[PDB]
Amino acid sequence: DLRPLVPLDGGRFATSDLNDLYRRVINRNNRLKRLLDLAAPDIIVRNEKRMLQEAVDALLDNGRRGRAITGSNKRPLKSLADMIKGKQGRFRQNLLGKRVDYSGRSVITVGPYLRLHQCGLPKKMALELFKPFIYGKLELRGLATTIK
């Protein structure tokens, strides 16, 4: 789930780069297994071992290794640790700075008439944010039957 393979409308799909990175490392591991049961020459198997070390090393992170081994996208594949660090990563952005339910935005204007301890509200926004409250009151009053 954390590396999903969501279906996009129109037959396409969307995955995360973790998916193909896992796929490439599994491919190199299967290849080295096949090599080991062949007892092929140690040059080829040593290149396989080197390649798998490369694959895992670019899996856990993209920076220490020389070239972030990109894909058909002309962008670098985005590996594991990049989903924790950085501005975009979970920590700095999504784990403190996150969206909120029961919150709305608008343009501000003045309306100098009203006292400091209060602010005007649009009626539509007010009826949106406090939707569940109004459901609860309409059920407390019996002005409706059920939540639907």
Binding site: N47, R50, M51, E54, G66, R67
Partner: peptide, 29 residues
């Protein structure tokens, strides 16, 4: 990360020692 802030136009002695020891593209290798 001496730290030096290099650009294009325990590390200081650590990186100094690793910069005191003198390619890994597996295609070049």
């Amino acid at each position: 990360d001496m730290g030096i802030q290099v650009m294009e136009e325990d590390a200081a002695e650590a990186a100094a020692q690793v910069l005191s020891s003198v390619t890994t593209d597996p295609v070049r290798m």
